[PDB]
Design a protein around this ligand. Sequence first.
Ligand SMILES: Cc1cc2nc3c(=O)[nH]c(=O)nc-3n(C[C@H](O)[C@H](O)[C@H](O)COP(=O)(O)O)c2cc1C
Ligand SMILES: Cc1cc2nc3c(=O)[nH]c(=O)nc-3n(C[C@H](O)[C@H](O)[C@H](O)COP(=O)(O)O)c2cc1C
Lengths: 122, 122
Amino acid sequence: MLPGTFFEVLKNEGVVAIATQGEDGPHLVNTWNSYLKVLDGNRIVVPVGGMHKTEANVARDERVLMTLGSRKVAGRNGPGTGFLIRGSAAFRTDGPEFEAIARFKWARAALVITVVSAEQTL
Amino acid sequence: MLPGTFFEVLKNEGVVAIATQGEDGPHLVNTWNSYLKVLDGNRIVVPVGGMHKTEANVARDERVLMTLGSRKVAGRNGPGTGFLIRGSAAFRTDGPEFEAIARFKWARAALVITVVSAEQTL
Ligand SMILES: Cc1cc2nc3c(=O)[nH]c(=O)nc-3n(C[C@H](O)[C@H](O)[C@H](O)COP(=O)(O)O)c2cc1C
Ligand SMILES: Cc1cc2nc3c(=O)[nH]c(=O)nc-3n(C[C@H](O)[C@H](O)[C@H](O)COP(=O)(O)O)c2cc1C
């Protein structure tokens, strides 16, 4: 379901945000557009170095939200666009989703988000 | 309390993410690094065109989280850095906080974030 414009965003660098639900309120962490790996079957993989509070949150509520964008891709009414992605998350420490990001030697795990919806919000 | 490195990030374009607490989970919306105005008092001002769900969430729980960064500013271990900002939010529709973003013709309000902590997370 990810549209072509999402793939054009990923050709450009930028800050990705990942929100999870904590018992206390939301939590928000980041990665880089250039670190995301998209796999077949609507999966986006993030290399995990820290994300310890995020991991604790996902263990109790697997729903996540993610945003990303780029001023270098056109939106509906001028330069710049981005996406709100909703999905479910899991952490993996082995298997092909882990091997997709194992080139980052600092990664202790892979955060795998299975996308359920993608909205271009600009 | 906002440090010099944060102002260096703001000289570069990027996607800002703002998380609020909803009824049924977090919500996450964006702005651009180039749209933020910073006022005396640890106050960050965001021009509001939509953010209707965000505004409903803030009316119930004023706490927000914000992230932003840039690959063009050095972090602690290599190129690229960014920040986790925690603060409290209010929407303003008159006064100096609104005037700071009034040049945006589509703005309906100013989202004013009063910063309580700022962490450089890379
Ligand atoms: C621009 C940016 C990119 C980041 N990329 C990563 C990343 O790819 N993986 C990672 O684990 N943390 C990354 N971080 C740090 C995370 O945002 C987070 O601060 C850290 O993993 C701790 O997560 P936690 O608060 O869930 O314990 C990045 C931070 C910034 C500002
Ligand atoms: C990169 C980017 C920049 C955006 N900047 C703004 C902005 O400055 N102000 C705004 O109202 N919405 C902006 N949006 C749209 C918001 O993220 C959000 O989708 C919209 O305001 C609706 O908010 P709500 O879901 O809280 O109702 C931006 C979207 C993207 C992808």
